[PDB]
Amino acid sequence: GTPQMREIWSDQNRVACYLEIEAALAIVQADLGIIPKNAAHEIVEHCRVQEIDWALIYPVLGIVQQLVANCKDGLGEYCHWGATTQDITDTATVMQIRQSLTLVKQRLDSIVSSLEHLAEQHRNVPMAARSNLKQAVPITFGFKMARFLATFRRHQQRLVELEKRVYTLEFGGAAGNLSSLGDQGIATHDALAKMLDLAPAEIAWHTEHDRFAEVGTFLGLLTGTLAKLATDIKLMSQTEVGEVGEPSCVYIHACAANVRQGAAALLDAMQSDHEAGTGPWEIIWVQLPLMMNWTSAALNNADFVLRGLQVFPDAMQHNLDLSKGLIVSEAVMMGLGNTLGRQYAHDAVYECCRTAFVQDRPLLDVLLENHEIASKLDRTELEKLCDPANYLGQCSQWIDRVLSP
Amino acid sequence: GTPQMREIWSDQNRVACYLEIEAALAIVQADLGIIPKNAAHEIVEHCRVQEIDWALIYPVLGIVQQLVANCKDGLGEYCHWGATTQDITDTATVMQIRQSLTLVKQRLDSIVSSLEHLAEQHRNVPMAARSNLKQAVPITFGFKMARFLATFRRHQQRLVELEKRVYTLEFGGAAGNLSSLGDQGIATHDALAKMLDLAPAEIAWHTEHDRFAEVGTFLGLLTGTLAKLATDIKLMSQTEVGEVGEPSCVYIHACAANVRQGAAALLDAMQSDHEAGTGPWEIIWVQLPLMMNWTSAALNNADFVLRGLQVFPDAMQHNLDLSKGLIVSEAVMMGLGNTLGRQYAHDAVYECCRTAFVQDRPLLDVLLENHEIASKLDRTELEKLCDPANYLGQCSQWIDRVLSP
Amino acid sequence: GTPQMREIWSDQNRVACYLEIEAALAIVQADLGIIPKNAAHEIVEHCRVQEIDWALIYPVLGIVQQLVANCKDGLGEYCHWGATTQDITDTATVMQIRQSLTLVKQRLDSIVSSLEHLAEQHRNVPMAARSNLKQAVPITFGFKMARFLATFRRHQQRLVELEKRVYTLEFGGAAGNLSSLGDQGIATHDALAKMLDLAPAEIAWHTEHDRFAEVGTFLGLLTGTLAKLATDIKLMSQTEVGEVGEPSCVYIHACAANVRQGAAALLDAMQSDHEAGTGPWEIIWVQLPLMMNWTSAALNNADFVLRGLQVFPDAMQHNLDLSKGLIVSEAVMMGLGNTLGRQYAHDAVYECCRTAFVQDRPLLDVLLENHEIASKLDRTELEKLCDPANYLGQCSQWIDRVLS
Amino acid sequence: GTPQMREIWSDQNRVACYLEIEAALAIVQADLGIIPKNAAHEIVEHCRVQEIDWALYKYPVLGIVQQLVANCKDGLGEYCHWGATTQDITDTATVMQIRQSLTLVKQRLDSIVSSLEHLAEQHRNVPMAARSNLKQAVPITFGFKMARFLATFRRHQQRLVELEKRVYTLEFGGAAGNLSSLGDQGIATHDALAKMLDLAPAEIAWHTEHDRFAEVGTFLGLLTGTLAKLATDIKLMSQTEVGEVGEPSCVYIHACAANVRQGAAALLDAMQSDHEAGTGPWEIIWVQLPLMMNWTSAALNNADFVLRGLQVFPDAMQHNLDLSKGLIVSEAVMMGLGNTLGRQYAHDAVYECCRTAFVQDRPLLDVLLENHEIASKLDRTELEKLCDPANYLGQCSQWIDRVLSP
């Protein structure tokens, strides 16, 4: 992961969420009259990570013991009231997921910016579109970048839409009903949710892992797009192609591949049992932080390579001419269809292409060896049809469509 | 799959969308003056599946040949103009995905309806909350049904949000620029999108398999919940438990397992290359129809079992009382906490619990053999504290919260 | 899938395994005196798929009913004795898995044969080795084919080793103990295994899905190699590369991608419960035939493309020269190290390479513009060092190692 | 993971294998006359992990070989790593770690097979209800259940041995697998190093093959799969409403099985590498393999422990067996009466007694005795004996004997 993301899921930050949740709970339950105000005043005072000794099997109760034994007069005996261990972790993860998606939103912003710039800069730079790694028809490199831009924006919408579901609180107690809090449970839950800038929960979700999984599936979709970017780039940076040059993409392949399988594990964890299951919880506890760190590795590399990406229009022009005009045969067909018969127009270029291909000669040269062509049309305009730059299509217009929203 | 969903993705339905797309294109392209007005009239006339010989090998061009060779006066030379094969296939898939989500939305209503009824009907039927298949604390069966209900509503929200991205058109030609349509390309695209009640595409997406993948990951989340439901039922319908009864769930388990792995394939297909690529398309071409029919099988079984679910509160009573009050030991702790110290109360019930556990005797009897207990509290309320039905917490209240929005 | 493999898993063939299994059971149990000789003698007579109404919820009991009701004198009441439905399906699958692996073994022979031919034929054809899609150092195309050959041979060993575990019988009744057969259960089971040329089972495996899953994971490894091959080919057949030509590979990508994810489903199906479980079983019932048909599609395409593969040595030479000799800079260093100083040799060619690269000029041209170089050795052999075709290494010998 | 397995894949162990590989290469390459004999003595002497400053470098191997060359006097360190590429060191070192890891797996599997062998015998005759789809089916013994696992864990052991002969191979091919810089001594150096490291020589390079590592991965997937079924059955049998067994931990094995299998899929995906060398596919293996090894060891440790200390309560199995009040052994009653009254007629009649005994929640014996045809053609002493689950156990001790003989 990246130093930014690798600390979000570090212990130091994690147990910080722990102390931040316990303090808010103490405040909430004091205001509701569940615990003494002065005990709460002391619980919160010692909820500072700077004051925790890192002793070397319980992730949360290990902290609340160092907090209970660190409060004067045994006032620390009043924290963690009515809350279960999973409540602290799940809500803490939710807090961490938000911190992570802030970076993702920031990296996505930069990536969309870089793409917007490249789509404009190379708006009209011609190149060969490739289908199954074979050349197809002429397009512009800015058109290629525009197709990515439209994708990352869809991913941006996906991220925003899931935030309103994921940013929920997890405070349901042992069986999700908060028995030991009696009737103050729902009062405490909604109080804590407002305290933590989280949405109140409709009902407990200690075994309903749909929220966390949605994050995984999004990370999988996003990394998937980032992988296509690295594939096209490293393809275009081939020794034999050289249409672009990196300023780092090969790493995105591992991130996306690990992330997609990780998301599948999270979908498996959705098949939890009853009100609590250690197994499924453990799966999320393991994959989710990894998936966050893989995706940040991908976004960072992707952001960098685009910001410093080198584009070589000369190489793109050269590759377009490998076909010696064959690539724009469709243009020659439609162009010549006016002077010669439409039926003959197709039948002549089509046959002239086979000749020029088996003979590895320019299409223009085989067209001019047909007498009707050489007689009813001259070289200057016959060449203009065989120019790949003339069959660029209506791309710049599409590029504008993507840059308008 | 189910007969309802297997006809959406049947061959007959597919070639039906093909012919419906070709007709709309002929209309649109005539209206723009791209093709002859009378030629379109005959193209549309032969866009009836009833007129196609199932000689079966090409997916689209096998049909467009039967349409061209079926149009008199050589008018069939004008269909499929400027469109590539994937344009027809993907757009048809988009159409089929919508029909499929029509069924999914309806089954989700039946499933959400059933849960609302069960959440109320069994609102107060008590039962033992289970953590790791071990008993924990008492809750009500209606509380369990609400937790599923609240989830399926989230899945419904997710379904709607992706519809606005999925219901897009795919008409970009060979490289997404619609070269052969010249300056009429974007005009034709938006026209066809309006013709087919689809949103127009910002830019081509022949290798941007994010939309279809979005569908896949959704089916994974949705089936994930349907899988947890089937687990809880068949667990609660165990011979040794018998708390519920089916009217069939075991099949849902396989669906969830296949759909999640299929989704992983779709995320893999997202790493497509350049402008067009067979294979990534093939993965989707195979998985999506398979995944749709598995999910429909799951929704059908889930829908049916819920409408006919047998709930036996007596079994929940029997299993709940097996602990002889141990399950509601926490209640006894808090009760004596008023007369005696709260902390001191807990240390005593736990010790009273060890005895009743080693002696396999009711906790109430072990409470009464401690004299200090019998002196600071009488049998009538110690019986009332050891009653599991009294330590349910604010469940009916949580149940109400899920039933409001 | 392919017509050869797609009929192995067709209904016609499946219920044929059903009817062949039931007959052997009637013979064995009659032979053991469990059922009458004449009932078995007649039950087997009606175990012909041609006599089953294909117009038809239960996969096996639907067939065994057409046999019970089709036997004269009600003699058909003696078939399916003591056996559970899963016994018939699982044993039938095992029989089908064997038939499928027969095709796979043949495809591997053809593919390994083609590779042996290609590795020898193009033993010395030089080409550019590629690392991260960038050129690295010269190797021969036969050397590339040998690396595949060594792998497909490993896959062959894997196939044979699992065969001794997979070709087992599944006859355990309801709980794997064959209660209703009493003490003749083990007698009947072991008899049936020999009847069907299967190994008898140590104990029941109605929920012990290690065998079927192992098949899946092997299919995963095999298609894994087939996928790399298709990628290398289509990379080498790019418009801008043109080192080879297909006679079709893009399908292998989907096959491998489905088979690899399918295998995970089977690994999930291993988490079965207790003595029998629908669902975990269902996963295998669905994935196994699909993965078998994808793998045959991949093997089929791969076998054909290798037999008809076009190799263009001229294109391979052209790509090697793109670097203008830089690709064999390591060769120039070690060669010149004797005439010049070893340390200087490295320090000088290294600097000349940076120049020739930033200047997009031949390395030989920059080497001769160094005065010491031009003075202590002449162009005839300086050209000889810059030739990529001379720095191939021990490829032909390595190729010999793979061909044994 | 476990301290032993968490230590095999620790950095200290990894950089230790690097130095052991570098030393063996220097010895071999001096012995072949490729490098100076005196230079090797300086390379080997400074191949001690105690002499490495843990100044992390973000190159995995060259960060060490730079500290090894710069730590050798007389510029004699210029001769290490000759003709070897970075992946050569990592892959060969990984092979070494896989061997140490598979050493632990073999030991833990022995303990597990031993425990099961003992439980299968001890509880050979302990009756219990076979369960199909979590519903009761017919009576079996706990030893039969434990033996079915035993037969599987033995199969897993055979699989491990078969893959070792392929995995324990060397990785020495240079940049493209041709060992250009070693000239004609390349194949000589490779085969020498393989013997030096007690590894099999490689037929040809495998920098982009990944068939070996994937085989290991899929194996860990199969193994953890079985460990997952075991963890399910125990906690299923330790359920509050069941109580047939008791743990002394199984819920953790469930996550390992789920994580290892999806990791295995990643390793199969990494097989689609390109040409002669490729980062990414290598990275996938670099990340998943150590994770999968430590997940699998965690499972094996928990599984081994719970099996040695598994508490079995035969009374609970008896208690659950009688919940059906004889219906569970209804097939037995049919075959008994099938002799006097006829097989076909017996089932068609006993089934009706089952519907009654169930609808009335009365013992099957009681409804059987109220039918006169039964009461007249069969006596209470054996009608009671037929409805006893312990009498319809079938051949189990024999199957257990079959599994325990090899």
Ligand SMILES: O=C([O-])/C=C(\CC(=O)[O-])C(=O)[O-]
């Ligand atoms: O640098 C490394 O440790 C390994 C590499 C780099 C590469 O791909 O060139 C590999 O996996 O081959």
